[PDB]
Structure 1
Amino acid sequence: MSDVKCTSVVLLSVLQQLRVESSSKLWAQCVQLHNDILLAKDTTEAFEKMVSLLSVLLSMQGAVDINKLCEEMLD
């Protein structure tokens, strides 16, 4: 569960560099969702907060095109 901490630390920064540190409420919830994941001591809670955190990035209609990111992977 080294990875799940680490994905989490980088998800927040991806959202941070998308200038949602202005976001105040969106940010605050992510900050404690990221904080609760770091403080986890099991896999489910950690994936359970992890699933919520990432919902944010996917709900931003223009934050980034996942099709074109995904199409960038194996090309």
Structure 2
Amino acid sequence: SKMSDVKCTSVVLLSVLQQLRVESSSKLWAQCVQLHNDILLAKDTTEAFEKMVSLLSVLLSMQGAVDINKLCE
């Protein structure tokens, strides 16, 4: 089950994003919801991973928001 684990992760990812008040930057929310709706309908795999990289980078772009070390432990 490798294909269908690249959609659930996106659901979780966008939920976490929205939980950090990224709704404000009305351009950022546009691009994020675009990447999410786009991942969900993707018959391929590599394309799914492409959009996943981009979305995750949106999450990482902020430094002080989500403590990365205490999680990656």
Q: TM-score, normalised by structure 2?
A: 0.90
How high is the sequence identity, in percent, across the aligned residues? 99
1:20–1:27 Cα contact (<8 Å) kept:
yes
Quote the offset at 1:55 in angstroms: 0.2
Superimposed CA distance per residue, residues 46-72 of structure 1 (whole angstroms, 9 cap, x where no aligned partner) = 0000000000111111111111112xx
Runs ≥4 in structure 1, deviation > 4 angstroms?
none
1:57–1:63 Cα contact (<8 Å) kept:
no
Question: Which of the pair is proportionally richer in helix?
Answer: 1
* Runs of at least 5 residues in structure 2 that lack an aligned partner in the other structure: none
> Alpha carbon RMSD of aligned pairs, Å?
1.2
How many residues in Structure 1 have an aligned counterpart in Structure 2?
Answer: 71
Quote the offset at 1:26 in angstroms: 0.8
Q: TM-score, normalised by structure 1?
A: 0.88
State the alpha-carbon separation in 2 of the partners of residues 23 and 39 from structure 1. Answer: 25
* Runs of at least 5 residues in structure 1 that lack an aligned partner in the other structure: none
